[PDB]
Amino acid sequence: GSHMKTRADLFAFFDAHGVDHKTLDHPPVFRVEEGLEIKAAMPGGHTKNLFLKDAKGQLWLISALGETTIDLKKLHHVIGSGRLSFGPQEMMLETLGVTPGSVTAFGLINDTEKRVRFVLDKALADSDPVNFHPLKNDATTAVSQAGLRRFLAALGVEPMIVDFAAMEVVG
């Protein structure tokens, strides 16, 4: 809809659920910096966000670390069906209504319609942990594999693992 969540609700959201995650009030990037200094504490950050949608109409969020080269060609092949392909960003702005770049970070927050499934890459689920660039692009946010559990458990989302190398679900 025409309503996007805000930090006031986000910070309080994870604060009310006592999630194992904790947002960092770090400053933005003024000069050429990859967050190497903070990286020492956060093994994530330089992650990638994929935006795809199935033929059924549901969107799929596939997050992977910035170390491996995700194979979109082998992504859909993992299942064969679903017609998973690059979807129009407009779909993420209407459902997730977030900023361009990392909609999988806090896309579920805005997606209160129980839509859009959260898919974690075998490499991303390897404890990136899951640092992404949500609406709070101004600040950093890290959530351990144990954190998202309480995050999706509230929204009603079920995280799934898929190893592009194994061509199957890692459950």
mmCIF file of C-alpha atoms in Angstrom:
data_model
loop_
_atom_site.group_PDB
_atom_site.id
_atom_site.type_symbol
_atom_site.label_atom_id
_atom_site.label_comp_id
_atom_site.label_asym_id
_atom_site.label_seq_id
_atom_site.Cartn_x
_atom_site.Cartn_y
_atom_site.Cartn_z
ATOM 1 C CA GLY A 1 0.000 0.000 0.000
ATOM 2 C CA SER A 2 0.887 3.687 0.182
ATOM 3 C CA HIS A 3 2.537 3.359 3.595
ATOM 4 C CA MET A 4 6.163 2.601 4.457
ATOM 5 C CA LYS A 5 7.457 1.666 7.910
ATOM 6 C CA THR A 6 9.901 3.890 9.793
ATOM 7 C CA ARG A 7 12.891 3.487 12.108
ATOM 8 C CA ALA A 8 10.659 4.417 15.045
ATOM 9 C CA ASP A 9 8.683 1.254 14.302
ATOM 10 C CA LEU A 10 11.669 -0.824 13.192
ATOM 11 C CA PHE A 11 13.954 -0.210 16.170
ATOM 12 C CA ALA A 12 10.945 -0.806 18.417
ATOM 13 C CA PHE A 13 9.908 -3.875 16.426
ATOM 14 C CA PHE A 14 13.147 -5.764 17.068
ATOM 15 C CA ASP A 15 13.306 -4.217 20.540
ATOM 16 C CA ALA A 16 9.891 -5.596 21.489
ATOM 17 C CA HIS A 17 10.780 -9.080 20.243
ATOM 18 C CA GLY A 18 14.197 -9.032 21.887
ATOM 19 C CA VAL A 19 15.629 -10.277 18.598
ATOM 20 C CA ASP A 20 19.225 -11.511 18.689
ATOM 21 C CA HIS A 21 20.011 -8.637 16.324
ATOM 22 C CA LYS A 22 21.097 -5.069 17.076
ATOM 23 C CA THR A 23 21.138 -2.101 14.697
ATOM 24 C CA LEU A 24 24.294 0.022 14.685
ATOM 25 C CA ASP A 25 24.053 3.817 14.748
ATOM 26 C CA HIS A 26 27.112 4.203 12.520
ATOM 27 C CA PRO A 27 27.595 7.160 10.136
ATOM 28 C CA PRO A 28 27.107 6.926 6.348
ATOM 29 C CA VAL A 29 29.820 6.756 3.688
ATOM 30 C CA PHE A 30 31.220 10.152 2.703
ATOM 31 C CA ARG A 31 34.437 8.921 1.088
ATOM 32 C CA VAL A 32 35.593 5.729 -0.629
ATOM 33 C CA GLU A 33 34.994 3.172 2.121
ATOM 34 C CA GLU A 34 33.793 -0.437 2.205
ATOM 35 C CA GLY A 35 33.278 -0.505 5.962
ATOM 36 C CA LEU A 36 36.475 -2.475 6.527
ATOM 37 C CA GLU A 37 36.890 -0.886 9.957
ATOM 38 C CA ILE A 38 33.449 -1.956 11.175
ATOM 39 C CA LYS A 39 33.658 -5.183 9.174
ATOM 40 C CA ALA A 40 35.843 -6.492 11.999
ATOM 41 C CA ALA A 41 32.642 -6.760 14.035
ATOM 42 C CA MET A 42 30.278 -7.357 11.115
ATOM 43 C CA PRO A 43 31.313 -10.131 8.689
ATOM 44 C CA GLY A 44 28.467 -9.020 6.443
ATOM 45 C CA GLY A 45 27.476 -5.757 4.802
ATOM 46 C CA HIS A 46 28.924 -6.119 1.311
ATOM 47 C CA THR A 47 26.075 -8.497 0.478
ATOM 48 C CA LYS A 48 23.906 -8.716 -2.638
ATOM 49 C CA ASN A 49 20.127 -8.484 -3.018
ATOM 50 C CA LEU A 50 18.247 -10.329 -5.763
ATOM 51 C CA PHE A 51 14.725 -9.450 -6.900
ATOM 52 C CA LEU A 52 12.787 -12.229 -8.633
ATOM 53 C CA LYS A 53 9.130 -13.232 -8.934
ATOM 54 C CA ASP A 54 7.444 -16.556 -9.688
ATOM 55 C CA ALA A 55 4.621 -17.151 -12.167
ATOM 56 C CA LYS A 56 2.273 -17.693 -9.223
ATOM 57 C CA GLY A 57 2.654 -13.994 -8.477
ATOM 58 C CA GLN A 58 4.698 -14.411 -5.305
ATOM 59 C CA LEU A 59 8.109 -12.750 -5.034
ATOM 60 C CA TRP A 60 11.287 -14.522 -3.929
ATOM 61 C CA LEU A 61 14.134 -12.895 -2.001
ATOM 62 C CA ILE A 62 17.503 -14.541 -2.632
ATOM 63 C CA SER A 63 20.374 -13.103 -0.593
ATOM 64 C CA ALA A 64 23.995 -14.180 -1.030
ATOM 65 C CA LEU A 65 27.381 -13.109 0.333
ATOM 66 C CA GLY A 66 29.614 -10.860 -1.748
ATOM 67 C CA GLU A 67 32.132 -13.665 -2.208
ATOM 68 C CA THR A 68 30.402 -16.168 -4.493
ATOM 69 C CA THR A 69 29.057 -15.498 -7.986
ATOM 70 C CA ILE A 70 25.338 -16.284 -7.887
ATOM 71 C CA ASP A 71 24.236 -18.077 -11.055
ATOM 72 C CA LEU A 72 20.803 -16.737 -12.001
ATOM 73 C CA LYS A 73 20.808 -19.284 -14.825
ATOM 74 C CA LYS A 74 21.243 -22.094 -12.297
ATOM 75 C CA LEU A 75 18.996 -20.393 -9.742
ATOM 76 C CA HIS A 76 15.694 -21.341 -11.375
ATOM 77 C CA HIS A 77 17.180 -24.603 -12.651
ATOM 78 C CA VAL A 78 17.346 -25.666 -9.001
ATOM 79 C CA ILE A 79 13.621 -26.385 -9.250
ATOM 80 C CA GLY A 80 12.916 -26.095 -12.963
ATOM 81 C CA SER A 81 9.410 -24.717 -12.495
ATOM 82 C CA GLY A 82 8.024 -21.578 -10.880
ATOM 83 C CA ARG A 83 9.099 -19.439 -13.825
ATOM 84 C CA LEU A 84 11.437 -17.561 -11.484
ATOM 85 C CA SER A 85 12.893 -14.585 -13.355
ATOM 86 C CA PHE A 86 14.016 -10.980 -12.898
ATOM 87 C CA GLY A 87 10.948 -9.066 -11.756
ATOM 88 C CA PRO A 88 10.169 -5.346 -12.138
ATOM 89 C CA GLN A 89 11.427 -3.205 -9.258
ATOM 90 C CA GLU A 90 8.003 -1.552 -9.348
ATOM 91 C CA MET A 91 6.728 -4.738 -7.705
ATOM 92 C CA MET A 92 9.083 -4.252 -4.757
ATOM 93 C CA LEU A 93 8.041 -0.606 -4.446
ATOM 94 C CA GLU A 94 4.357 -1.539 -4.291
ATOM 95 C CA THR A 95 4.662 -4.518 -1.945
ATOM 96 C CA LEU A 96 7.840 -3.715 -0.015
ATOM 97 C CA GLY A 97 7.807 -0.020 -0.865
ATOM 98 C CA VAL A 98 11.505 0.176 -0.025
ATOM 99 C CA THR A 99 14.547 1.842 -1.585
ATOM 100 C CA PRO A 100 16.505 0.434 -4.555
ATOM 101 C CA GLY A 101 19.429 -1.837 -3.734
ATOM 102 C CA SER A 102 18.495 -4.132 -0.859
ATOM 103 C CA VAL A 103 14.750 -4.741 -0.596
ATOM 104 C CA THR A 104 15.269 -8.175 0.951
ATOM 105 C CA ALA A 105 16.793 -6.546 4.031
ATOM 106 C CA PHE A 106 13.522 -5.221 5.451
ATOM 107 C CA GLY A 107 11.151 -6.051 2.611
ATOM 108 C CA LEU A 108 9.129 -8.381 4.824
ATOM 109 C CA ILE A 109 8.475 -5.536 7.261
ATOM 110 C CA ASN A 110 6.458 -3.565 4.708
ATOM 111 C CA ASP A 111 5.071 -6.750 3.161
ATOM 112 C CA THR A 112 2.412 -7.271 5.830
ATOM 113 C CA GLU A 113 0.299 -9.091 3.245
ATOM 114 C CA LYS A 114 2.119 -12.321 4.097
ATOM 115 C CA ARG A 115 3.549 -12.169 0.575
ATOM 116 C CA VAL A 116 7.090 -12.586 -0.749
ATOM 117 C CA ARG A 117 9.075 -15.571 0.521
ATOM 118 C CA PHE A 118 12.482 -15.129 2.154
ATOM 119 C CA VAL A 119 15.124 -17.366 0.578
ATOM 120 C CA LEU A 120 18.614 -17.567 2.075
ATOM 121 C CA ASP A 121 21.546 -18.710 -0.060
ATOM 122 C CA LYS A 122 23.685 -21.579 1.231
ATOM 123 C CA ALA A 123 26.485 -19.010 1.394
ATOM 124 C CA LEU A 124 24.336 -16.342 3.046
ATOM 125 C CA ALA A 125 22.988 -18.754 5.660
ATOM 126 C CA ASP A 126 26.605 -19.560 6.517
ATOM 127 C CA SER A 127 26.472 -16.716 9.040
ATOM 128 C CA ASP A 128 27.140 -13.627 6.924
ATOM 129 C CA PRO A 129 25.389 -13.229 9.085
ATOM 130 C CA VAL A 130 22.685 -11.437 7.099
ATOM 131 C CA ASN A 131 23.791 -7.799 7.151
ATOM 132 C CA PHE A 132 21.802 -5.917 4.511
ATOM 133 C CA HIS A 133 20.949 -2.383 3.388
ATOM 134 C CA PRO A 134 17.311 -1.949 4.496
ATOM 135 C CA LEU A 135 15.360 1.306 4.761
ATOM 136 C CA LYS A 136 17.957 2.303 7.358
ATOM 137 C CA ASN A 137 20.634 2.572 4.668
ATOM 138 C CA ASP A 138 21.986 5.380 6.849
ATOM 139 C CA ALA A 139 22.854 2.803 9.508
ATOM 140 C CA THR A 140 24.064 -0.802 9.615
ATOM 141 C CA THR A 141 21.984 -3.793 10.702
ATOM 142 C CA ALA A 142 23.201 -7.312 11.474
ATOM 143 C CA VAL A 143 21.084 -10.334 12.402
ATOM 144 C CA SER A 144 22.455 -13.765 13.301
ATOM 145 C CA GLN A 145 20.895 -16.943 11.909
ATOM 146 C CA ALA A 146 19.107 -17.148 15.259
ATOM 147 C CA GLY A 147 17.773 -13.611 14.961
ATOM 148 C CA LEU A 148 15.804 -13.853 11.724
ATOM 149 C CA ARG A 149 14.043 -16.786 13.388
ATOM 150 C CA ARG A 150 12.217 -14.385 15.707
ATOM 151 C CA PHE A 151 11.913 -11.856 12.880
ATOM 152 C CA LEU A 152 10.102 -14.074 10.376
ATOM 153 C CA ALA A 153 8.313 -15.933 13.170
ATOM 154 C CA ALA A 154 6.453 -12.689 13.861
ATOM 155 C CA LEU A 155 5.684 -11.636 10.287
ATOM 156 C CA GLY A 156 4.791 -15.223 9.446
ATOM 157 C CA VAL A 157 7.573 -15.747 6.915
ATOM 158 C CA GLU A 158 9.441 -19.037 6.529
ATOM 159 C CA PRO A 159 13.141 -18.831 5.570
ATOM 160 C CA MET A 160 14.371 -21.451 3.103
ATOM 161 C CA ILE A 161 17.896 -22.503 2.135
ATOM 162 C CA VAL A 162 18.962 -23.406 -1.403
ATOM 163 C CA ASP A 163 22.498 -24.387 -2.399
ATOM 164 C CA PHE A 164 22.950 -23.441 -6.056
ATOM 165 C CA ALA A 165 25.881 -25.863 -5.972
ATOM 166 C CA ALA A 166 23.789 -28.753 -4.658
ATOM 167 C CA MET A 167 20.759 -27.792 -6.747
ATOM 168 C CA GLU A 168 18.407 -28.495 -3.840
ATOM 169 C CA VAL A 169 17.036 -27.190 -0.540
ATOM 170 C CA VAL A 170 19.435 -27.323 2.408
ATOM 171 C CA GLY A 171 16.979 -28.144 5.177
#
